[PDB]
């Protein structure tokens, strides 16, 4: 048939598009992921770095 006729997309479309609400919920979930990934990567580096400080038997002879 004619290429100007668009097929049926109605079982996935929102009843009201409302562009301020759809961009706001998607950016909440991406922002929460970057929040938790930065706090997780920070404690990971500090676990490896603090293993080079003085051990428990060295501190006992201080």
């Amino acid at each position: 048939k004619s290429t100007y006729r668009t097929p049926n997309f109605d079982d996935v479309l929102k009843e009201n598009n409302d562009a301020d609400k759809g961009r706001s919920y998607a950016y909440f979930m991406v922002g929460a992921m970057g929040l938790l990934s930065s706090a997780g990567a920070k404690s990971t580096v500090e676990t490896f770095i603090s293993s080079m400080t003085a051990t428990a038997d060295v501190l006992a002879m201080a």
Binding site: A56, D57, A60
Partner: protein, 50 residues
């Protein structure tokens, strides 16, 4: 000895327990060996020499 403090005994309880055993010390000014009572840095001693 130091690992028992704050887990099962207080700090002055472990000091009295370790002071009932004697350990090797550095030799004197002539070079003869000495002994000394134990401290919290020492390890718990065993009953046999070898």
């Amino acid at each position: 000895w130091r690992t028992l403090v704050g887990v099962s005994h207080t700090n002055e309880e472990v000091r009295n327990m370790a002071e009932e055993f004697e350990y090797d010390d550095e030799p004197d000014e002539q070079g003869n060996p000495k002994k000394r009572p134990g401290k919290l840095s020492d390890y718990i001693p065993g009953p046999y020499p070898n």
